[PDB]
Write a protein that binds this ligand. Structure first.
Ligand SMILES: [Mg+2]
Ligand SMILES: [Mg+2]
Ligand SMILES: [Mg+2]
Ligand SMILES: [Mg+2]
Ligand SMILES: [Mg+2]
Ligand SMILES: [Mg+2]
Ligand SMILES: [Mg+2]
Ligand SMILES: [Mg+2]
Ligand SMILES: [Mg+2]
Ligand SMILES: [Mg+2]
Ligand SMILES: [Mg+2]
Ligand SMILES: [Mg+2]
Ligand SMILES: [Mg+2]
Ligand SMILES: [Mg+2]
Ligand SMILES: [Mg+2]
Ligand SMILES: [Mg+2]
Ligand SMILES: [Mg+2]
Ligand SMILES: [Mg+2]
Ligand SMILES: [Mg+2]
Ligand SMILES: [Mg+2]
Ligand SMILES: [Mg+2]
Ligand SMILES: [Mg+2]
Ligand SMILES: [Mg+2]
Ligand SMILES: [Mg+2]
Ligand SMILES: [Mg+2]
Ligand SMILES: [Mg+2]
Ligand SMILES: [Mg+2]
Ligand SMILES: [Mg+2]
Ligand SMILES: [Mg+2]
Ligand SMILES: [Mg+2]
Ligand SMILES: [Mg+2]
Ligand SMILES: [Mg+2]
Ligand SMILES: [Mg+2]
Ligand SMILES: [Mg+2]
Ligand SMILES: [Mg+2]
Ligand SMILES: [Mg+2]
Ligand SMILES: [Mg+2]
Ligand SMILES: [Mg+2]
Ligand SMILES: [Mg+2]
Ligand SMILES: [Mg+2]
Ligand SMILES: [Mg+2]
Ligand SMILES: [Mg+2]
Ligand SMILES: [Mg+2]
Ligand SMILES: [Mg+2]
Ligand SMILES: [Mg+2]
Ligand SMILES: [Mg+2]
Ligand SMILES: [Mg+2]
Ligand SMILES: [Mg+2]
Ligand SMILES: [Mg+2]
Ligand SMILES: [Mg+2]
Ligand SMILES: [Mg+2]
Ligand SMILES: [Mg+2]
Ligand SMILES: [Mg+2]
Ligand SMILES: [Mg+2]
Ligand SMILES: [Mg+2]
Ligand SMILES: [Mg+2]
Ligand SMILES: [Mg+2]
Ligand SMILES: [Mg+2]
Ligand SMILES: [Mg+2]
Ligand SMILES: [Mg+2]
Ligand SMILES: [Mg+2]
Ligand SMILES: [Mg+2]
Ligand SMILES: [Mg+2]
Ligand SMILES: [Mg+2]
Ligand SMILES: [Mg+2]
Ligand SMILES: [Mg+2]
Ligand SMILES: [Mg+2]
Ligand SMILES: [Mg+2]
Ligand SMILES: [Mg+2]
Ligand SMILES: [Mg+2]
Ligand SMILES: [Mg+2]
Ligand SMILES: [Mg+2]
Ligand SMILES: [Mg+2]
Ligand SMILES: [Mg+2]
Ligand SMILES: [Mg+2]
Ligand SMILES: [Mg+2]
Ligand SMILES: [Mg+2]
Ligand SMILES: [Mg+2]
Ligand SMILES: [Mg+2]
Ligand SMILES: [Mg+2]
Ligand SMILES: [Mg+2]
Ligand SMILES: [Mg+2]
Ligand SMILES: [Mg+2]
Ligand SMILES: [Mg+2]
Ligand SMILES: [Mg+2]
Ligand SMILES: [Mg+2]
Ligand SMILES: [Mg+2]
Ligand SMILES: [Mg+2]
Ligand SMILES: [Mg+2]
Ligand SMILES: [Mg+2]
Ligand SMILES: [Mg+2]
Ligand SMILES: [Mg+2]
Ligand SMILES: [Mg+2]
Ligand SMILES: [Mg+2]
Ligand SMILES: [Mg+2]
Ligand SMILES: [Mg+2]
Ligand SMILES: [Mg+2]
Ligand SMILES: [Mg+2]
Ligand SMILES: [Mg+2]
Lengths: 175, 111, 76, 141
RNA sequence: GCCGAGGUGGUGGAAUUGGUAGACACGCUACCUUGAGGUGGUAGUGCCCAAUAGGGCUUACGGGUUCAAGUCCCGUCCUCGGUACCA
RNA sequence: AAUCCCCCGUGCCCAUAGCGGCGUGGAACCACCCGUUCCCAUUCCGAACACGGAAGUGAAACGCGCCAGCGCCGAUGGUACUGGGCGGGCGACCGCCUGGGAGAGUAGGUCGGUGCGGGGGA
RNA sequence: CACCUCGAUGUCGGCUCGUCGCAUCCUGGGGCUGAAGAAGGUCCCAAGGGUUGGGCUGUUCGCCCAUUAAAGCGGCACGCG
RNA sequence: GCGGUCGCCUCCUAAAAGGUAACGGAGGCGCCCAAAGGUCCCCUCAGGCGGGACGGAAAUCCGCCGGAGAGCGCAAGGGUA
RNA sequence: GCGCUGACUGGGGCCUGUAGAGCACUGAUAGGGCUAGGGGGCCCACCAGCCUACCAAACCCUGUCAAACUCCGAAGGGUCCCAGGUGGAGCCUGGGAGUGAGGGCGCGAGCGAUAACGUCCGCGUCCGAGCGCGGGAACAACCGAGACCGCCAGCUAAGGCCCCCAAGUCUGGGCUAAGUGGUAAAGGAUGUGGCGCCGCGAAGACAGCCAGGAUGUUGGCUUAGAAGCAGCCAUCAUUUAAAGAGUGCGUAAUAGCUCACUGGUCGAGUGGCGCCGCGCCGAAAAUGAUCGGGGCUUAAGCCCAGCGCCGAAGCUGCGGGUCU
């Protein structure tokens, strides 16, 4: 649930060079501040595979600090589908917006053995308090039924806060 | 419902006027009173004012108009201003709008 | 082949740019619709052609929603 | 095979292939994918042979995606003729594919299975390819 | 050997513009009719367990395409119009 | 005249000023309103336009506020592309140097700003 | 395609004389066989030599008769006036 | 040679000024209108939903929503409430 | 004749809709969702009517494409102004022309087959007319460089420095074992050198080597019999450190053998996935072979660094000519 990164500071130095030196460029920003940094590619990869804009990265970084950051965009060059720039979003005391995984729980969900699990969104956009950050979200109902649909307001929704628009959407069905 | 016969007709007649280059004798008339304003565009500035609600007069608003009509001349003609165009905006050239114009006599005019 | 046709290039466009000195007559823009609208001291002929109305210099104005304008600000 | 019905214009130039995959580009439907390493025109009849090869090696279930589509009209004279006098004539359709693009991509199957299918499917293509899984990065939206 | 079309019950052959058949026909079997027949008219009839019900197989043969193929893709054999240096 | 608040005119910027929800304003302005004699009217209608009035109402409209659901605006990094200069691959194409540097997207921002002139206030 | 040749680079086929390539028709040597043997199939090595006589047609080609270890495919200005 | 073409307008090709070729990709003109002309005054569409005898997808009518996707005699483009 | 106006350059304004990107319009388009109506399949034949395993409008998500699409939009380019710029610059008037068959290359497109020493335009360049000079083995247009004349002087450019052949068998560090270099692809491979991730492993793996293999049994189904070892299969279940009614031989259904399995020995690494550098296969044409040749293997090959030298008709020194 807790991922450590590291970091450094950028001002000059062409990203081309950093790139060459195993380091991965990137910026750090939010309502209050904005500064350019660079992580270690080999390191960052290890973290992001598991992290993945779903969980929080604390970002060490000289300055001795440890900043609460979500990753809000990853630019990867298409030719080799490897990353080439990460930008980290730092959390403060004010509800944010993010993506939360969807633990497809329950069973074949009604009419079991069998039916259609119908996987739509392994994530979901939610406006939530930076303090309480759901590790995931239980998606069960029971279940379930045949040719039904768990909209969105039917879902669990832990004591985070709420949804992010889209009151009515798929997420569930059997056909 | 975007823009209205009012707003439209307003631009239509007022846009034409602003092409000819002259000073604008803009006429706003309300239910109770009728006001008049000599404006210079490109300078975005008014030169001679003449209301009825500013001359505290009353009694038959077609006759009041003409008064604030002649009132505009006097005040204005004394500033050099002689020739002008005359707005008319949304109002048909009639009644108290026509009246004020007919009052604008004793001052440049051609109307 | 059923194709093979085309028409003579009409050499359309702006003829005087901003900050160019012109003269009453000088046509300033050749265009199809009203891509530019006649501003100060700028006439426009039956083929939508903009020309100086007086001498002076050329200046352009982008009135956004109101379109783009060519003015001939005097100096004469 | 696979052509786009109703077209504003038949016969279109050819343009170049200097691009680098508009995108794309990051997998977005399945568990695994086939990515294009080289630029090429992929023919509807090449796509159909790649699709079939998979649905076939998948017993019949299966769940392709393709993601590339032949909307470009490919012309060609009637051979035995000389230049001039009209153009090509249209003898099929192609899809334009620069590096990066994700073609096909499958889901709902094992790994040692999906990966064997994508390999087969890849042999039907005139370019070099690459098999992918799909990690966070892919979740670029 | 080369390009296009088509191969169907015992026979002739249609649906061939995308959706559930081996039509109406000629046999053949029984029936009406006749003194008995011919013709004509009913009804059975592609195949097999089927009382019917209804399972399932048919579109030259085999292999894939699609939810579905007599039809789209090919391969083999059969056939019809074509067609194969060269100065 | 100074400063300021509200309101009526009229400009300019041309969506950060817009849609929508809610709330407010009638002393004054404005509107609606009250009438259709008169000027003048509606291919029918005093709806509009127009005149004469003013009892009534801020319901409509308009003005002023608040709300970021939509709309609009939108960096910073990083790329794409590319002047110019060099390389590489059979090619299709690719890379380096030096200058310029988007688009999308992210963080955000916004439910206006201001000119002149009036009327009323302090 | 129109690059040398239009102050000329004679054009099919046959005959004659060859020579070269091997993607080998036969003969030599091999592996595999759904190779019992004999006889084949298929692939590999191998260009030393060999690779028939007739009917038809200008024909090349091809069909056919009789044979054969086999009746090889190509290049050489579709080799060679 | 046969075929096609030959002047004029629109669009692309055309590499963000102009211009730019090919038997390159696609269309159109050889008219028309005494009002489809001048001026002054008014008016604002297309659609979508709801409502309404004969009215039907669509005749005429009422309501809300509708910045132009309508219209501008005919091609296309630019333009335009 | 006028004479600082020229190309080019700096700063500033204005014009543009391409490259790129985008999907807001015009169209194209993958999947899913929700729903006009139909395919239907049908209840009726009076409303009807239920369902969607084919459509499929719009609408919503997730994805994309476009020369004749653009909500966007660089770099550049055009033009004017003010500056620099005296140049075989510019402008004006006039005398004389020749050319109006271009070609290669680079870049951007169309045609063609993402063929042509193809063809047609655009912007550049060279050959044309520099078939003069150096390099590229030889070679109009690729690299270098614009040849006034003379020199038995010097420095350089490209390219080179083992010998033919001028100058290093020069100094480091790595790579390659093919003569690769001296090449042709999809694809393929315990070649070789590096980087990395994962699985197992001193509770001791991986090679081998000892030990044992069920049992009701023929499993039943098929079926003289299939008894694992014809076949279809229901493929049991127990027990065990541990053997699947049995993977392969055997096969008058048997016998016997053997294996996936655990114990012991030995004891150390072992197995798999990627990644880069250089190589390997893929690899058959016609007269005599060859990288220009000889020849080259810690290189006389490839990559990274360096220091020197050789090298043109470029530059320099010396003298000379002619024009301005
Ligand atoms: Mg042309
Ligand atoms: Mg044109
Ligand atoms: Mg602009
Ligand atoms: Mg994208
Ligand atoms: Mg029948
Ligand atoms: Mg009888
Ligand atoms: Mg009898
Ligand atoms: Mg009888
Ligand atoms: Mg009888
Ligand atoms: Mg058939
Ligand atoms: Mg079949
Ligand atoms: Mg106001
Ligand atoms: Mg806007
Ligand atoms: Mg509002
Ligand atoms: Mg109130
Ligand atoms: Mg209000
Ligand atoms: Mg009151
Ligand atoms: Mg009152
Ligand atoms: Mg109100
Ligand atoms: Mg008000
Ligand atoms: Mg943006
Ligand atoms: Mg930027
Ligand atoms: Mg931006
Ligand atoms: Mg605010
Ligand atoms: Mg005041
Ligand atoms: Mg010639
Ligand atoms: Mg030529
Ligand atoms: Mg001669
Ligand atoms: Mg001769
Ligand atoms: Mg062979
Ligand atoms: Mg032999
Ligand atoms: Mg034998
Ligand atoms: Mg043999
Ligand atoms: Mg051989
Ligand atoms: Mg003869
Ligand atoms: Mg022969
Ligand atoms: Mg013959
Ligand atoms: Mg013979
Ligand atoms: Mg011979
Ligand atoms: Mg020949
Ligand atoms: Mg000959
Ligand atoms: Mg002779
Ligand atoms: Mg002869
Ligand atoms: Mg002719
Ligand atoms: Mg242009
Ligand atoms: Mg309507
Ligand atoms: Mg209606
Ligand atoms: Mg209705
Ligand atoms: Mg329009
Ligand atoms: Mg039109
Ligand atoms: Mg248009
Ligand atoms: Mg238009
Ligand atoms: Mg000067
Ligand atoms: Mg210039
Ligand atoms: Mg300049
Ligand atoms: Mg634009
Ligand atoms: Mg493009
Ligand atoms: Mg679109
Ligand atoms: Mg559409
Ligand atoms: Mg769809
Ligand atoms: Mg474009
Ligand atoms: Mg256009
Ligand atoms: Mg923008
Ligand atoms: Mg410039
Ligand atoms: Mg400039
Ligand atoms: Mg100067
Ligand atoms: Mg000269
Ligand atoms: Mg001259
Ligand atoms: Mg002369
Ligand atoms: Mg000529
Ligand atoms: Mg010529
Ligand atoms: Mg030319
Ligand atoms: Mg030239
Ligand atoms: Mg040229
Ligand atoms: Mg050459
Ligand atoms: Mg290049
Ligand atoms: Mg070429
Ligand atoms: Mg040429
Ligand atoms: Mg060049
Ligand atoms: Mg010449
Ligand atoms: Mg030369
Ligand atoms: Mg020259
Ligand atoms: Mg020569
Ligand atoms: Mg030479
Ligand atoms: Mg040389
Ligand atoms: Mg030379
Ligand atoms: Mg010289
Ligand atoms: Mg010299
Ligand atoms: Mg030297
Ligand atoms: Mg050098
Ligand atoms: Mg050498
Ligand atoms: Mg030497
Ligand atoms: Mg040495
Ligand atoms: Mg060394
Ligand atoms: Mg062991
Ligand atoms: Mg047993
Ligand atoms: Mg050599
Ligand atoms: Mg000298
Ligand atoms: Mg001279």
């Amino acid at each position: 649930m807790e991922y450590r990164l590291k970091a450094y500071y950028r001002e000059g130095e062409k990203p081309s060079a950093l790139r060459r030196a195993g380091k991965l460029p990137g910026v750090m920003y939010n309502r209050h501040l904005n500064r350019k940094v660079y992580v270690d590619l080999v390191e960052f990869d290890k973290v992001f595979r598991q992290a993945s804009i779903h969980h929080v990265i604390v970002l060490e970084l000289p300055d001795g600090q440890s900043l609460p950051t979500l990753v809000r965009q990853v630019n990867l060059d298409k030719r080799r589908r490897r990353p080439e720039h990460v930008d980290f979003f730092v959390l403060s005391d004010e509800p944010v917006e993010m993506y939360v995984p969807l633990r497809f729980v329950g069973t074949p969900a009604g009419v079991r053995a069998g039916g259609v699990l119908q996987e739509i969104h392994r994530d979901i956009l939610v406006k939530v308090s930076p303090r309480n950050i759901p590790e995931f979200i239980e998606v069960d109902v029971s279940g379930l039924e045949i040719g039904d649909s768990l909209h969105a307001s039917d879902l669990k929704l832990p004591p985070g806060v709420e949804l992010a628009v889209s009151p009515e959407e798929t997420i569930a069905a059997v056909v | 419902a975007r823009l209205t016969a009012y707003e439209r007709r307003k631009f239509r007649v007022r846009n034409r006027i602003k092409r000819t280059g002259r000073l604008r004798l803009s006429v706003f008339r309300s239910l109770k009173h009728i006001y008049a304003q000599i404006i210079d565009d490109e300078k975005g500035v008014t030169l001679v004012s003449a209301s009825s609600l500013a001359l505290k007069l009353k009694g038959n608003k077609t006759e009041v108009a003409r008064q604030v009509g002649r009132a505009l001349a006097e005040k204005a003609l004394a500033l050099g201003i002689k020739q002008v165009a005359f707005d008319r905006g949304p109002y048909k050239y009639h009644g108290r709008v026509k009246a004020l114009a007919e009052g604008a006599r004793e001052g440049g005019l051609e109307f | 082949t059923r194709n093979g046709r085309d028409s003579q290039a009409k050499r359309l466009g702006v003829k005087r740019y901003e900050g160019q000195v012109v003269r009453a007559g000088n046509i300033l823009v050749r265009q199809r619709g009203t891509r530019f609208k006649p501003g100060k001291n700028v006439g426009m002929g039956r083929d939508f052609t903009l020309f100086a109305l007086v001498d002076g210099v050329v200046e352009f104005q982008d009135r956004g929603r109101l379109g783009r304008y060519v003015h001939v600000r005097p100096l004469a | 095979m696979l052509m786009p019905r109703r077209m504003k214009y038949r016969k279109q130039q050819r343009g170049r292939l200097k691009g680098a995959t508009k995108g794309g580009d990051y997998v977005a439907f399945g568990d695994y994918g086939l990515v294009a390493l080289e630029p090429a025109w992929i023919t509807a009849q090449q796509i159909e042979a790649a699709r079939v090869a998979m649905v076939r090696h998948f017993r019949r279930g299966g769940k392709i995606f393709i993601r590339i589509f032949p909307d470009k009209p490919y012309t060609k004279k009637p051979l035995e003729v000389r230049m001039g006098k009209g153009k090509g004539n249209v003898e099929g359709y192609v899809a334009v594919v620069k590096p990066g693009r994700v073609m096909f991509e499958v889901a709902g199957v094992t790994e040692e299975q999906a990966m064997e299918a994508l390999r087969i499917a890849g042999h039907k293509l005139p370019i070099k390819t690459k098999i992918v899984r799909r990690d966070a990065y892919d979740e670029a939206q």
